[PDB]
From a paper:
In this study, we show that [name] plays a critical role in phagocytic cup formation in macrophages. Crystallographic, electron microscopic, biochemical and cellular localization analyses revealed that the [name] F-[name] domain possesses unique hydrophilic loops that contribute to two-dimensional sheet formation of [name] on flat membranes of phagocytotic cup, indicating that the sheet-like assembly of [name] is essential for phagocytosis. In addition to the F-[name] domain, GAS7b possess a WW domain, and [name] and GAS7c possesses a WW and an SH3 domain, while GAS7d contains only the F-[name] domain. The structures of the F-[name] domains in both crystals were almost identical, with a root mean square deviation of 1.2 Å. The [name] F-[name] domain forms a helical-bundle dimer with a shallow concave curvature, which is one of the flattest curvatures amongst the known F-[name] domains.
GAS7b ([name] and Homo sapiens), [name] ([name]), and GAS7c (Homo sapiens) are [name] splicing isoforms. To understand the functions of [name], we determined the crystal structure of the [name] F-[name] domain, using the crystals of an F-[name] fragment and [name]. In the crystals of [name], only the F-[name] domain was visible in the electron density maps. In the [name] crystals, the periodicity observed on the monolayered membrane appeared to be absent. The monolayers showed the striations formed by the [name] F-[name] domain, GAS7b and [name], all of which indicated the sheet-like [name] assemblies with striations similar to each other on the membrane. The zymosan phagocytosis was rescued by the endogenous-level forced expression of GAS7b and [name] in the knockout cells, but not by the GAS7b ΔFFL2 mutant or the F-[name] domain fragments.
Residue numbers in the entry:
A (entry chain B): 173 to 475
B (entry chain A): 172 to 474
The structure:
């Protein structure tokens, strides 16, 4: 059995299968254990720190997306401001008659249009922009605490590692104290030396009692970092899936708003179309000749 | 017996028989404009046709103004499309990888597609609605002011025949005074000179009558040419106007049509986005990332 950076994997020999925790589905709690070194020589970080960077970049994407929608909204606003300003414009005003009414309704239909696109800007803000920004508001914080809570367990792993090395030398280097009492008692021997085989053999029996406790507490405070590793990577995986589905959801609402917006726009012409059917040249000629006529009597001769 | 205003003779405002309307019901230009009209004040008191021209003119004016309105719309559209295009190239949330990444990418593109649609529309507007409003009877300002002097000239040529009659009706009566006042001077001290003078200033009272004859006959003629020409070249105006109306109608109808199909093609630019959002699978992405960034594969043991 091997040991790299204070965590003991079994040795790369006759490896008993190793059943994956969560099969098929590429679990965060399965494919991240042993650490990884930065391609250079330094920056050799934890088999988890990447999960944080993924999480943080995630909440990051999220924000950039929202910023994008803001830009779209600003665009929209302006488009509406302009259609509005044009809709108030004084052009071709004095056109009288059914045709006049018709033009007028065109000039108005630009205002309707303006509204539609504006309302759309607002629903963008409401249903797409905000819920992206304000989704898990402080999250880089919850993540950076969820970080060093692991880091701390890895430190409490490394101290038990040092604790076993400076209590493994205690055994092996004081086993010279069992060997130097059968090899170096072979000179004097049999005297009041009730200490060479009795006492100094204990530094090879008290030091077994050292490595026992230190490897017990290493192995304990490892499979305590291990289990809180499993569960708080699963918590990440879950939170991630959740993020994806949230973004997907709100993007679907972006398309949805788009869709229904365009639909309400292509409808602001129906009043115009409606008035344009009622446009009758001859009726207008009436409503005008009535109002401006001069005499209906046709001249004769003399005297 | 029969009146005469501004050199044109209508029958007296008594019980004048019916007056068959030229073109009945339909308020024909050649029916309700004969007698002139005064500016509501006292001056200026203008011709009973000038208004028909002024209307034609206001017409081609309206026409222009309308084109200018559409222009503005087009400017607006051009801009909106430009901005949507700039945003479509925008780099936000780029590093989102995975099926969600592709989906987001397609959102950013749909803005370009959209932009395109709105531009294609600004164009269809310029071609099919703006231009045809400006360039409808391009020289109309020419043909109207020729059509003016054709009536106007016949009206001067009338007022002149009228003056010719009046100052030759004065001729008559003043050579009838020189008759009663020369027959009255016969009945006083009767001689030769004041007899031959009665023969003479009495033939001079028939030449003034055979003169008044022609002057009135020619008045009547050069009236019933202004009459005829009035009728038919008013009808020409009525026609032109109507033609205008339905031209404008038609092109507005097309404004709405373009509006319409524009919004329809816009509401289609989301189908790549919707289609891609359904292909969003968190677990698939977790696979494509855990594959490329995995480290540990093997899970720790004891000692």
């Amino acid at each position: 059995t091997i040991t790299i950076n204070c965590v003991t994997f079994p040795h790369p020999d006759t490896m008993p299968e190793q059943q994956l925790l969560k099969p098929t589905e590429w679990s965060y709690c399965d494919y991240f254990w042993a650490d990884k070194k930065d391609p250079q020589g330094n920056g050799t970080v934890a088999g988890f720190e990447l999960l944080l960077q993924k999480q943080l970049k995630g909440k990051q994407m999220q924000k950039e997306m929202s910023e994008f929608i803001r830009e779209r909204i600003k665009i929209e606003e302006e488009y509406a401001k302009n259609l509005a300003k044009l809709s108030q414009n004084s052009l071709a005003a004095q056109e009288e008659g059914s045709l006049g009414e018709a033009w007028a309704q065109v000039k108005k239909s630009l205002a309707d249009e303006a509204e539609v696109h504006l309302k759309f800007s607002a629903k963008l803000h409401s249903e797409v922009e905000k819920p992206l920004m304000n989704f898990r508001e402080n999250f880089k914080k919850d993540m950076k605490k969820c970080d060093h809570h692991i880091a701390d367990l890895r430190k409490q792993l490394a101290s038990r590692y040092a604790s076993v090395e400076k209590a493994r030398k205690a055994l092996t280097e004081r086993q010279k104290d069992l060997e130097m009492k059968t090899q170096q008692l072979e000179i004097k021997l049999s005297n009041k030396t009730e200490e060479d085989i009795k006492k100094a053999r204990r530094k090879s029996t008290q030091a077994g009692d050292d490595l026992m406790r230190c490897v017990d507490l290493y192995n304990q405070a490892q499979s305590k970092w291990f289990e809180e590793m499993v569960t708080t990577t699963l918590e990440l995986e879950r939170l991630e899936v959740e993020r994806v589905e949230m973004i997907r959801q709100h993007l679907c609402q972006y398309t949805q708003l788009r869709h229904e917006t365009d639909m309400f726009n292509q409808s602001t012409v129906e009043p115009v179309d409606q008035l344009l059917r009622k446009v009758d040249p001859a009726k207008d000629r009436e409503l005008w000749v009535r109002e401006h006529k001069t005499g209906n009597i046709r001249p004769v001769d003399m005297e």
